[PDB]
Amino acid sequence: MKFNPFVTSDRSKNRKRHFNAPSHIRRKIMSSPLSKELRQKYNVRSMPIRKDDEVQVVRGHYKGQQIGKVVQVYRKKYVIYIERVQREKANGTTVHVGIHPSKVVITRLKLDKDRKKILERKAKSRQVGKEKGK
Amino acid sequence: APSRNGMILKPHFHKDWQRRVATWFNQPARKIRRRKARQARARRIAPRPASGPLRPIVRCPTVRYHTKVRAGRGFSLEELRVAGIHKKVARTIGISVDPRRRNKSTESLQANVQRLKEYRSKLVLFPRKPSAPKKGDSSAEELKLATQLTGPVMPIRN
Amino acid sequence: AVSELAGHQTSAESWGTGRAVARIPRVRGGGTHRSGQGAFGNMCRGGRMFAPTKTWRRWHRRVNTTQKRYAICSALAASALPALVMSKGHRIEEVPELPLVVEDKVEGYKKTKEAVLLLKKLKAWNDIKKVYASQRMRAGKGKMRNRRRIQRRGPCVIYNEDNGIVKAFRNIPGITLLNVTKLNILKLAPGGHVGRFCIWTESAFRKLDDLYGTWRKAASLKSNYNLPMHKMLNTDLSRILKSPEIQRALRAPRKKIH
RNA sequence: CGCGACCUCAGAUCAGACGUGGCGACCCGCUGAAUUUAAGCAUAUUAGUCAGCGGAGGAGAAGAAACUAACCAGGAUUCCCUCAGUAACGGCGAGUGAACAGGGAAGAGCCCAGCGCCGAAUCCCCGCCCCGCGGCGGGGCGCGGGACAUGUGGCGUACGGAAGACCCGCUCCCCGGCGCCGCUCGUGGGGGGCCCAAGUCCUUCUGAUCGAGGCCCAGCCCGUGGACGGUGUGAGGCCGGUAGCGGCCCCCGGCGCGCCGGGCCCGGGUCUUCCCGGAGUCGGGUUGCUUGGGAAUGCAGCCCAAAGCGGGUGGUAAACUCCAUCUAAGGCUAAAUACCGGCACGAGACCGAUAGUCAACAAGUACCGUAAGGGAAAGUUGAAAAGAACUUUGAAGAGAGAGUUCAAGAGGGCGUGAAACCGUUAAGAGGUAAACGGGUGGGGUCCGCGCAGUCCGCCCGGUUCAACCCGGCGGCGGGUCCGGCCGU
RNA sequence: GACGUCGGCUACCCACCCGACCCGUCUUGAAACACGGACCAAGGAGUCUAACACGUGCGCGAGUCGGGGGCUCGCACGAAAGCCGCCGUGGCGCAAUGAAGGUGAAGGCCGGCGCGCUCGCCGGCCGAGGUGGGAUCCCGAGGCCUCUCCAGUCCGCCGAGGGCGCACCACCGGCCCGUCUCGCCCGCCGCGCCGGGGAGGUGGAGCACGAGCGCACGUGUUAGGACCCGAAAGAUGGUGAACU
RNA sequence: GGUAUAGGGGCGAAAGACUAAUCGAACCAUCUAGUAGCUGGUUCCCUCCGAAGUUUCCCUCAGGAUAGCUGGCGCUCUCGC
RNA sequence: GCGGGCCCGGGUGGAGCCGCCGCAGGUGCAGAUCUUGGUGGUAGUAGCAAAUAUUCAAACGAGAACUUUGAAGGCCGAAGUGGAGAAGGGUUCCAUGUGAACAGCAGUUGAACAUGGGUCAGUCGGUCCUGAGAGAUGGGCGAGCGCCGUUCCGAAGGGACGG
RNA sequence: CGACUCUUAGCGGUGGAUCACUCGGCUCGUGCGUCGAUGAAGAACGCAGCUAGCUGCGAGAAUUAAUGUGAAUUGCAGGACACAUUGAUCAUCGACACUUCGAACGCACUUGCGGCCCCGGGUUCCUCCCGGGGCUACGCCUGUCUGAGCGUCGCU
Ligand SMILES: [Mg+2]
Ligand SMILES: [Mg+2]
Ligand SMILES: [Mg+2]
Ligand SMILES: [Mg+2]
Ligand SMILES: [Mg+2]
Ligand SMILES: [Mg+2]
Ligand SMILES: [Mg+2]
Ligand SMILES: [Mg+2]
Ligand SMILES: [Mg+2]
Ligand SMILES: [Mg+2]
Ligand SMILES: [Mg+2]
Ligand SMILES: [Mg+2]
Ligand SMILES: [Mg+2]
Ligand SMILES: [Mg+2]
Ligand SMILES: [Mg+2]
Ligand SMILES: [Mg+2]
Ligand SMILES: [Mg+2]
Ligand SMILES: [Mg+2]
Ligand SMILES: [Mg+2]
Ligand SMILES: [Mg+2]
Ligand SMILES: [Mg+2]
Ligand SMILES: [Mg+2]
Ligand SMILES: [Mg+2]
Ligand SMILES: [Mg+2]
Ligand SMILES: [Mg+2]
Ligand SMILES: [Mg+2]
Ligand SMILES: [Mg+2]
Ligand SMILES: [Mg+2]
Ligand SMILES: [Mg+2]
Ligand SMILES: [Mg+2]
Ligand SMILES: [Mg+2]
Ligand SMILES: [Mg+2]
Ligand SMILES: [Mg+2]
């Protein structure tokens, strides 16, 4: 149960905040879980999705064990485009099918300086939390 | 129109009373705010009583009561002179002083002087600086208690 | 309440007789759809509701303190009598004793696992199972008014002093925590029904006589209060009816149907 | 015949500042009605209300008795309960209508003129030096100016004050900077940023699960986290969040420490000697408004117009006589109080697109009037546009095929798609308009049988254990209350 | 009687016999040549606050109470709930009657002291009077009997008759306050234009061994917009001589 | 064409004429949901009981108060015991 | 089921819903010349009749009574159905293209719609002057926003020549 | 059996009622409680590659600088950026900038007329002319300067 008297806990207000969030907040919203191997290695639950990651589809029509690269991140529509997750239009044109990040597991990260910093911060915070628990 | 023995009533609702209706949905919030302010004020003066300065003994006019005893606004100047406390000094130690109150009876004067003496007896005058000057109490009776005095100081009982 | 300005923000005058209209105030002038249409009436579109709701309605009701104590004592007494607790729907079949009183070490709990283990040991976990099975969406407009989820009320836990027991029994659905000195009738009798299953603590159980007192002793914590007297002592009608004293003073019944 | 001071009065694109307007929910000062009630209506009521004008703040106003009382007295102002629908007012009709005391919230007291003592001991402006200077200050150096004796500053104001006499114990408060340790209660003060638990486990539905069954104990794991929202349904564990005296990184505010520049030689009690009061003001007559205030409650234009053991008040006008209580005609002050406007949040037994604000949407918009002003209608494909490629008739609008989708029997005002009304198909009927109630008959629609439906349920005739014993287990009732607890 | 046959009251259509004028409203009188009405969908009219009166339910009860305030939580459920030398300041009730100064509810019996003087003063006793009707309770002769005659404590029904008599009603008395008439005495700190008492009528929303307080529900009457819609009007502030 | 006269006001060779399609008192907003003893309307079923247009008073006669007619809630008793 | 209504079967629909014990209300429509929205008979009906009038051939075009071209017959008959302005309008002006909607028939046409383009000043006018009038300062009034008045209760010209 | 008309049913039309959804309202409550001559509220006109409206912005005109975050915006192209770089977008926002009217301020409101200083084009300050920059409103306080008076006085 929520106790902080400054949190929303309102259906319409939470929906308004979700659908009107700025781009940098939408980046945090569009986060996907890491694979079990990556979770074991980096000790990180989930990370925001990026344009150059390897992605497996967990739910939907395109569910499978294939590994595909992210084509682009469409934050306005809260969706991402994957390499081989595409459909044929009427005239034969190929169009990418949008998959929500929450239904996607990352099997390989695009490691940059900022990504490493985020991984270290998350791991240190989790370590501090588990030390507090003990 | 009257009908078979009802009371003759004259409601005072001929003005635009609905314009000036005062609701009381603010009552619990008002009480909470008052309690928070009271606690903050008590915390600001850590060793001083939260109620405030000592109040004198007062008898009520209007023969209806004629016997109850309540708290007065402050001790009169004659009572301070008899007790030996300067009027300007008294307000700085927590003694209520007002200059309008007269003194007709000897019994009330003596009762208030005795009350002032009793208050002075149980008073812990902290030193102005960490070093102890004259009239400051010993450090023995300074760590023994540094808490508020809940309720009125020396409550009045009839 | 509705806004005081609702429907009267327009300036509408009623067209007089001699015109096919029906003597209703209508919007004055303009080249709009809302022109000569109708306003100020509860039967008109837009209009104003009949007898608009006011904020100064008597929302709050007053109950005597003695009656509130009477009701809370009746609910506390009805916490006994396993028939009434069963009638409330609580799964009380395997509980070793309905006046379930537990040691004071429960206040020392600080983790939910200890709480669920204790509940399973006392065999009161079936109530939590029923609460889990009762979770579903509310029907009607309440979903869009922050009342989307509904569930069954579960067991109540009464403690003497707070030592972390609430945090342990905080994430278990259906469990309500009450203090002895501030027992609430709204939670001891949910829905106005007097039956309710409560789990007591030894200190809390012993404080009951100090809170209300017996018939021959005062409350000792309430300034002037005593337990209410019984209107009748021998409540069992069956025993009274077939008692020898009554049977000796009865006529022979007439049960021959004519 | 001019110059030099002073008093009154002008000019400035003279040096440096200040006011103007807006909002106005709450507040202050004026002005100020009529609808309405009195079953008519003129006094009254509506009502010191709406309309109009002026002036501020975060609150405003008020405020420390020219008071209340008549008691064994109380003691600034403001607000709550009660006093009280009472005293009182009123074609004594309708109606109007306080104050005191009592219990509380909060609580804080003071300063001038005059009277007098100090060599104007006082203040403003310009120049230079030092500090800091983004809410322009402090000190020093200037025979540099000005204001002020038609009165500045120090002491001092009704609770008495000033000066001497000599009784008593003794000498820290404030302002501006330089830095410093404690991160200062929602249990780390305010603002911002980045983060911290656990199934996408096995089958099985579906277009898609967040559905169903199961998984060392309601089931697997977390739980100080089982709120909420999103994700192709109904998710504690997919994601953001949620709980936490959880963490880290910056800014700000506040309380304390050492230093510098400073300002500051600051008492109480008794006695003695002097001093101590706001004028066209009080008050009286008058008239108008207002009030519960009634031979006049308050505010006023006009006339009269003061005194100092005086003046005011003591709810019936006047005289005489004692009592009680304050010291008006000068000024300041936070708190308890109000807040339909503004900024940022939280919540709901409220409405759910003819409802809820006029406005869920490019709404004070389109549009109307010369103008003051008036003022709408209007949400929904689909999970994903995957928004119908391509073939064919037609000039095209439009169709026929094909294709997408679970579904276009969802095709761009596209969710569900009622009634009024319309076309067509199937059936019935038809010269007293149609339609209706009661009673039958005929024809259809399907429903329930049946290839007899003769419907069962007990008693009677034509593979093991009850009867009866042994052992174990559990239960019922009883009294010698057999014994103890329990209990009136 | 059973593979083109059964049962289907009600609804689909049609036919026949009888009945049968269009609803709502004003009205003595409506089918009316009285008014409203083409049809369908959605909205649409006795509400809320306050004051009373009565009835009902609950708690306490000569008491009752929560107004406001204060102490516990940082509000998830909570602006709830619990508590108070505030438990009562204060309201209502427990005492009424006069304009007011004021007064203010018990008598009766017994013996004595003054002349028992229907009057005053001393000690004891009973403590809301009496009459009539009074639901219920108490006593109750006797009867009914019991397989035979007598005796017989017991479990019964009826029980003539005799009583204590709830609540309430009617009447007769008593008491309290105002007022009228006739009167005789009592006390003192101050002996008076002092104060008190009696009898007999009358006026009062009174007493005469109590019943209210708080909450909730319903009805009825009001003030409010007041079940909904409807004027001819009045007032305040602004805009127009582009027509005339 | 420019300008002046603005609502109890203007202007009028005078008709109560004109004053933005309104003039025996213009338009706009508010008081205002002004008042009406006067018209119209007033939303589900079943069961039980069931009226009056009459007396008196009222600037009372299309309306009220008051008695009468009605309903509901009871209570006090008697009994084919 | 007397009734208010209710329980099942079938079809469509695609995401929430109901019973019971209590609580609360903006809780039940046939009417109010009720409000809003929609739809009928009338009805393929009234009507598309004020100002003399059209005809032939060709072209574009799927399509011609209405467009264009040529010919013929007419009217407006210099107070015009002609050529230019003011007020007002505001892109309606010009070129190209479409024929969805509008031009009460039609249209190959338009003042419709969509693309673009177009207004050139010392001499033509505003700008300057004052008229009827309006309106500041000084002054007066007014509780006040402001009003009275334009020479009236004003130290009202900041200009110029010569030295 | 025709056509028309009446009732019922299936399907197809007009219409958008009902139900379910809701980034919107209404009500209560908490904290804060801040406009302007250093130019407020409001209004006008402009600003995007393709841009009408809404929203945002002001000739630095769909935003500049700085801080935090860290790989996009997106209807299409174009692309800047190397995302091992102050570095795309976002949020914060303390620096800078902020057209014309408007208390609106040189005079009036036509965007018309002026005056006082400085600089440049032209000059070789030379006045015309052109461009740019700073001033020029009312009331009022302190002070300065220049003044008036048959106001009250002093010397000659
Ligand atoms: Mg206090
Ligand atoms: Mg009247
Ligand atoms: Mg009337
Ligand atoms: Mg009248
Ligand atoms: Mg008045
Ligand atoms: Mg003041
Ligand atoms: Mg007072
Ligand atoms: Mg009272
Ligand atoms: Mg002085
Ligand atoms: Mg979800
Ligand atoms: Mg969830
Ligand atoms: Mg998580
Ligand atoms: Mg008197
Ligand atoms: Mg709407
Ligand atoms: Mg549809
Ligand atoms: Mg009538
Ligand atoms: Mg008639
Ligand atoms: Mg009829
Ligand atoms: Mg009609
Ligand atoms: Mg309806
Ligand atoms: Mg009544
Ligand atoms: Mg009206
Ligand atoms: Mg009148
Ligand atoms: Mg005439
Ligand atoms: Mg009405
Ligand atoms: Mg009448
Ligand atoms: Mg009856
Ligand atoms: Mg009958
Ligand atoms: Mg025709
Ligand atoms: Mg001719
Ligand atoms: Mg021409
Ligand atoms: Mg053209
Ligand atoms: Mg046409």
* DSSP-assigned letters across all residues of C34-101: SSSS--SSTTSSS---SS---TTS-------HHHHHHHHHHHHHHTSSHHHHHHTT---TT-S-SS-E
Of the candidates C101, C153, C109, which has an alpha carbon nearest to the alpha carbon of residue C127? Answer: C153
Helix or strand or coil: residue B35? Answer: helix
Among all chains, which residue has been given the structure tokens 């595909």? A68
Q: Which two tokens stand for residue C176?
A: 């309500």
The whole-angstrom distance between C146's CA and the closest CA on chain A is: 7
Q: Which long-range contacts (CB under 8 A, 24 or more apart) does C120-123 make?
A: C122/C95, C122/C96, C122/C199, C123/C94, C123/C95, C123/C96
CA distance A13 to C144: 11
Orientation angle between helical segments C112-121 and C125-133, nearest 10 degrees: 110
Instruction: In chain A, count H helices and then E strands.
Output: 4, 8
For C196-228, b/e burial (b = at least 16 CB within 10 A) is: bbbbbbeebbebeeebbbeeeeebeeeeebebe
**Best residue of A10, A11, A15, A132 to probe chain C, by most C CBs closer than 10 Å:** A11
Strand C101-102 with C149-150, pairing: unpaired
Q: E strand or H helix at C177, and its extent?
A: strand C176-179
Which residues, listed in sequence order, are joined to residue B121 by a DSSP beta bridge?
none
8 A C-beta contact, residue B100 and residue B79: no
CA distance B106 to B89: 24
CA distance A28 to A48: 6
Resolution of the structure, angstroms: 2.8
Q: How far is the CA of A21 from the C1' of H63 (A)?
A: 21
8 A C-beta contact, residue C194 and residue C73: no
Which residues, listed in sequence order, are joined to residue C198 by a DSSP beta bridge?
C156
* Phi and psi torsions of C186, nearest 5°: -65, -25
Angle at A41 between CA A35 and CA A44, to 5 degrees: 65
Q: Which two tokens stand for residue C67?
A: 């009656």
Taking the Cβ of residue C53 and every Cβ of chain B, the question of whether any pair is shorter than 8 Å is answered with: no
**Cβ neighbours of residue C227 closer than 8 Å, sequence gap 6 or more:** C73, C212, C213, C214, C215
Q: How far is the CA of C41 from the C1' of G140 (A)?
A: 56
* Phi and psi torsions of A56, nearest 5°: -115, 135
Q: How far is the CA of A73 from the C1' of H77 (A)?
A: 19
For A58-68, b/e burial (b = at least 16 CB within 10 A) is: eeeebeeeeeb
The whole-angstrom distance between C56's CA and the closest CA on chain B is: 6
Closest-lying ligand to the alpha carbon of B38?
1
Q: What is the DSSP string of C109-165?
A: --SHHHHHHHHHHTT-HHHHHHHHHT-EEPPSGGGGGT--EE-----EEEESS-SSH
Of the candidates A43, A48, A56, which has an alpha carbon nearest to the alpha carbon of residue A122? Answer: A43
Q: Terminal CA-to-CA distance of chain B, rounded, Å? A: 54
Give all strands (DSSP E) within B26-126, no chain letters.
57-59, 69-71
CB atoms within 10 A of CB C98: 17
Give the nucleotide with minimal C1' distance to the Cα of A72: H72
Q: Is the dihedral of CA C141, C146, C147, C148 positive or negative?
A: positive
Give the nucleotide with minimal C1' distance to the Cα of C40: F33
Local structure of residue B54 (DSSP, 8 states): B
For C82-94, b/e burial (b = at least 16 CB within 10 A) is: bebbeebebbbee
Experimental determination technique: cryo-EM
How far away, in angstroms, is C204 Cα from ligand 1 center? 35
8 A C-beta contact, residue C12 and residue C27: yes
